[PDB]
């Protein structure tokens, strides 16, 4: 009964761990792509709009997208990009580990 679920969970975790590419050998672009920058800005703006904690000084600002742009400028966005290779294997680059433009 439950052991069927335990087997399925074990298999899912094993396939996930096999798909992940370890940090020491990721061969993708060091630069943040324009698509990644846009989606980081949009998602961080959504999170701020939904009352998430903010890591920058609000200069009396009200635009969530502007606040997210400020966070990206000061590299304070707690997000991670999971770049997907065609075979389903993926790498993980943190936002502060990437260079904009």
């Amino acid at each position: 009964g439950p052991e069927d679920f335990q087997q399925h969970e074990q298999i899912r975790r094993k396939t996930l761990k096999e798909k992940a590419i370890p940090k020491d050998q990721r061969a993708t672009t060091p630069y943040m792509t324009k698509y990644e920058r846009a989606r980081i800005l949009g998602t961080r703006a959504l999170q701020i709009s939904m009352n998430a904690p903010v890591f920058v000084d609000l200069e009396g600002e009200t635009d969530p997208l502007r606040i997210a742009m400020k966070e990206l400028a000061e590299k304070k966005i707690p997000l991670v990009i999971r770049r997907y290779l065609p075979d389903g294997s993926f790498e993980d680059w943190s936002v502060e580990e990437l260079i904009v433009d």
Binding site: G1, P2, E3, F5, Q6, E9
Partner: peptide
């Protein structure tokens, strides 16, 4: 009854162990 107050799916890890 939303994805904000109740879990999406619940599964049992093991058989219930009496304490």
């Amino acid at each position: 009854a939303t994805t904000l107050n109740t879990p999406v799916v619940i599964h049992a890890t093991q058989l219930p162990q009496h304490v």
